[PDB]
Amino acid sequence: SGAIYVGNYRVVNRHLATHNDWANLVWEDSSRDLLVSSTTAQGCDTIARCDCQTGVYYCSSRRKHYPVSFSKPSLIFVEASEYYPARYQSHLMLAVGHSEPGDCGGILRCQHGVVGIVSTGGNGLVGFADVRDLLWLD
């Protein structure tokens, strides 16, 4: 679990969005596993606008942060799950690092701000949904 809070927006994994997120929907994209909902309170986070390929992510299954080198956002094949059929997920960045399903929502940050959130993983890999291209979040 986990979310980014920026301005009057809450960014979550689309497969983990709540009834309240869908009732206050701003934008969603199943191909990116992202959903953004509106909030009444001002958010605590700021978004990176950069081309960093290194950063640090929070891993809830280890209660720890880990450093990572990650690929540029791209179209990656993701196997079927209880949430989606087998498909290509877009704007996804992969890295070597531990992750389990419940780790989705952990933030990846570089020195400039929030880069994205954990969205996929397996066998020593972790994948992050990029948010740096969503200029309207600011």
Ligand SMILES: CSc1ccncc1NC(=O)N1CCC[C@H](C(N)=O)C1
């Ligand atoms: C950190 S998620 C993870 C980690 C380790 N084994 C497996 C997984 N699970 C996954 O990758 N998925 C299940 C939830 C929906 C994800 C999607 N973005 O399509 C795919």
Ligand SMILES: [Zn+2]
């Ligand atoms: Zn950066």
